[PDB]
Design a protein around this ligand. Structure first.
Ligand SMILES: [Mn+2]
Ligand SMILES: [Mn+2]
Ligand SMILES: [Mn+2]
Ligand SMILES: [Mn+2]
Ligand SMILES: [Mn+2]
Ligand SMILES: [Mn+2]
Ligand SMILES: [Mn+2]
Ligand SMILES: [Mn+2]
Ligand SMILES: [Mn+2]
Ligand SMILES: [Mn+2]
Ligand SMILES: [Mn+2]
Ligand SMILES: [Mn+2]
Ligand SMILES: [Mn+2]
Ligand SMILES: [Mn+2]
Ligand SMILES: [Mn+2]
Ligand SMILES: [Mn+2]
Lengths: 140, 140, 140, 140, 140, 140, 140, 140
DNA sequence: TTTTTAGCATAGCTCCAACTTTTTTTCTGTCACCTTATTTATTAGTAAACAGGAAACAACGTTGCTATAGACCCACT
DNA sequence: AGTGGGTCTATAGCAACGTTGTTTCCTGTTTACTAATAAATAAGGTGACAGAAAAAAAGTTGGAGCTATGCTAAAAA
């Protein structure tokens, strides 16, 4: 279920940023009611991905830490790839969050390879910008 | 709703391939029960995208034809882009069907620009293949 | 066989009007049992005029499309010719359907030439109406 | 049944031409086996249109004479109408025999009126010939 | 030759009664073998009184029609004259057939005049019957 | 056979006129070759109507005499009847000789009765002559 | 103030054990009302030893981490030193918590040196136990 | 309350040294205002540990004498124990005064046993000094 | 003259209780999807009434083909 | 002048035969019909999935005592 991965990624990022994850912050980040957050936390505890205390909080496990690190790496590489082409920053996060769950790992590897190819040379990026402008002249 | 676009694309492709769309073929293509197909057909008829006859069939409208053509163009360009990098053909259709609904049109334009950039030159594709192999040596 | 041409014309007209031909509609149009319609469809499929699918339907071919277009042109020109003289509309369709199969193409060309001759001038049609009334005074 | 009228017309014409109708002559004229001719003769005798003697021959009745005269008048007026336009004499008889049974009497009256209209003036026929040539220039 | 006139009269009467003359009917009427009938038909054809077709039949000519009409008139007036006096009907036809060939036309005119004289008045016929009875009393 | 009666009548009349019958006279009277006369004489001798001697001649018998007398009476009454009406004397003998063999005895009795009726009164003959002239005015 | 060091040590130990410090747990550990805990947390935040969020929680700083590590080392070495001599475990924690704040660092170094001296040899500990028993015989 | 024991010990030591305890001397020794000294004296008089006269002075009781003797013995043994290890004399009195109230009597017995163990042999003290120097080489 | 108490006056410190955000726990309704049942267009035989041709057959109509008579000639008695 | 023995065709059964008109089969050939068969439609049941609404705790805050020093003298050896 993509929701499980989304929650794991959000919890891992929030822990790495703040040092501690809270239910209200997770609910605000995912724009969902805290009751759904509690249900998801209990379900993840049933899956032994994290340890939950009834009124204290949550602590991620080693497997959860690895999954969160991998998901954060995928998210950041997707963001970098989308920014490379020249997409507006407003929709970049929305598109990445929408597509980060339906993509296969082979596609992620291919995207990373493309990013590496376009990062070692700037002339390729300049040519991409030039052809993009010359083809978007119709939108002008 | 992405389901509406998915149904419109499937109906348009089936009409262009066979010359006529049938409920059983749509249900088999989308792997859903024919009752759901009937419900979706009635809902789309409520949206004036196609004309439905109680026991005869469906006929697409001009607006429906344009939407289907645009969606088919997006789908085929996504397939070509995914095939360009070198992803396995088995997962290409699944990934395209999963991501064809959550992507913005600007991202589609950027993907088309990248495909055009990589299509005018084969040396770039050869260098991409070489760097892909040199970086996937770790998987060997 | 005139029945083959009649079926081809009916199928072509029904496809051009509705966008799809169904067995029940053809049977109702030709006032024959659907079993005879199925037999005729199979026989026409044996003649490679159309492609038939066991439970889906029928799709006309390019040769079938040309034959249907020619037959529809002949039918409409016959209807126009019969309406020009002043025959009652009730029997026009019956007479056209009865005589559309036993006429030669040269006769069709002559009828079209006569229609063109009487269409470029209205005084000729007025004189025809006047002489028709003056000769049908005996029926009064 | 058109076959009854066809047989009555043929018998009436043969009697008026030769003075006596024979089974072999009727069979040759209608290009059918004499057994079918005998069956038709017996059926017409059942309809009291003519008197048949077992080995002697056939004699038409007053009603049969009137029907034959009317049918011969229709046939000859159809032949004259077809010859007026300029159709080749080879197909004139075939077309007249094919269409003499499916036409209504009102259409026959209209054809006779048209023949009368085109017979009182020769300038109309000359103009028809001129426009026919000018439009058949494409066939040249 | 009286046989020629007899055959012409029989053929004319048979044509006027049946509408067509056949060899078997003529042979039965004249109580002669059909071979003699064929010989007589060929001889009459040599005299250009009628047209004969090898297996079809015979058709009388205008001269033959006039001769037959005159002979039938003579025969019927002879029958009426013989019936007027009161001869038995059984021998009337035999006597008329026996004497219709040896009589001159002036005698025929005189017989017709006598018939006209006895037809305008019935008292003369009544007196003839009375004197016939009074003189045939010896036969009683 | 009428020839037998004709020969008997001729022989009886010749015997009553000359007193003796000769072969040459009979042949001249009947306009036939003497060989046929000899054959007929031998045949009649076979019928025991007359006695013939090889080179002498013929003598009639009592039965032959009665038959000849009856035939002569019939011939003379026929001649008188034909002369009564007013037929030309030239054709009277020819007609009587032609019709004296095909008539029945009852017809002879009726003719004799008519002759007796017209002989007792001359006013009837005068009226017959008057009506004959008034009806033969058309021949004038 | 010894209270500041006590709170820092408790927070550091609780964070190292649970991964996150909560106000209720600190209050229970120090057996004080949560209002005093909030006051102490605010005062420590004023001293820039930790970062406090109004309703989220507390996170220690690098200086706070070093101070907590040093205090935990002192506490554990005091516990080990007290256990070495043979004091009852019930009062060991109470005595260590009572004396961990009034001792100088030089005294801590001397205690650690004594622990190291008595840890490298077990005969010294055995002699200490023997003399302890021989002198505590008076308590028996 | 440790303050009661501290005051009793100070009063006992001052009486044993000077022969008489005065309020000013006690206040100077404990570095507190004489008002607090008067309050403490009144409170101790309420506890029947000493007899106080309104302007004369204080006299200890037998129970007070025993408590003071025991506390002085504990203080002197603590001083000797701290001096044995080699702590600087400047902080020895401060540390002893700080820790003389929070220690249990069993700990005091253990400290006395350790002092007796290290007093019967000087080689142990020499080895302690040697290991102390060898481990404090890092401070050099 | 100093020392020795007796209030006088501020102080954070700690606690109690009220207050005000935050976390869980059922409670309550909802669209999603599966399953079932019903209804109706689509085929595949399935049998029966014919239409017409083939073939066979039963009169009809015809061409010699010769038997028997009625003129016609010629020679003979 | 009257008779007998070859010729000359005319007329008439008759005798196949060859056709013409009738009858009887066959033989596809088309037309209602009747299951059966899949395809299309409508009706029900669970069932996750949020709101939402208490409740239950947690975290905050505003105050009220409570000692703990620091003044400032008034009294006593
Ligand atoms: Mn993400
Ligand atoms: Mn996401
Ligand atoms: Mn698609
Ligand atoms: Mn899709
Ligand atoms: Mn049509
Ligand atoms: Mn038609
Ligand atoms: Mn016709
Ligand atoms: Mn016809
Ligand atoms: Mn007659
Ligand atoms: Mn006759
Ligand atoms: Mn006579
Ligand atoms: Mn005679
Ligand atoms: Mn501690
Ligand atoms: Mn502590
Ligand atoms: Mn002390
Ligand atoms: Mn102390």
């Amino acid at each position: 279920t993509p929701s499980m991965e989304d929650y794991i990624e959000q919890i891992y990022m929030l822990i790495e940023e703040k040092g501690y994850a809270r239910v209200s912050d997770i609910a605000e980040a995912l724009a969902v009611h805290p009751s759904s957050v509690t249900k998801m936390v209990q379900k993840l505890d049933k899956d032994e991905y994290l340890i939950y205390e009834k009124y204290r909080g949550l602590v991620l496990t080693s497997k959860g830490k690895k999954i969160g690190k991998r998901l954060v790496y995928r998210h950041e590489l997707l963001e970098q790839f989308l920014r490379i082409i020249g997409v507006d920053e407003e929709k970049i996060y929305n598109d990445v969050e929408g597509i980060e769950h339906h993509l296969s790992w082979n596609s992620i590897d291919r995207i990373g390879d493309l990013v590496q190819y376009f990062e070692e040379d700037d002339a390729r990026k300049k040519d991409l910008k030039s052809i993009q402008k010359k083809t978007e002249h119709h939108n002008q």
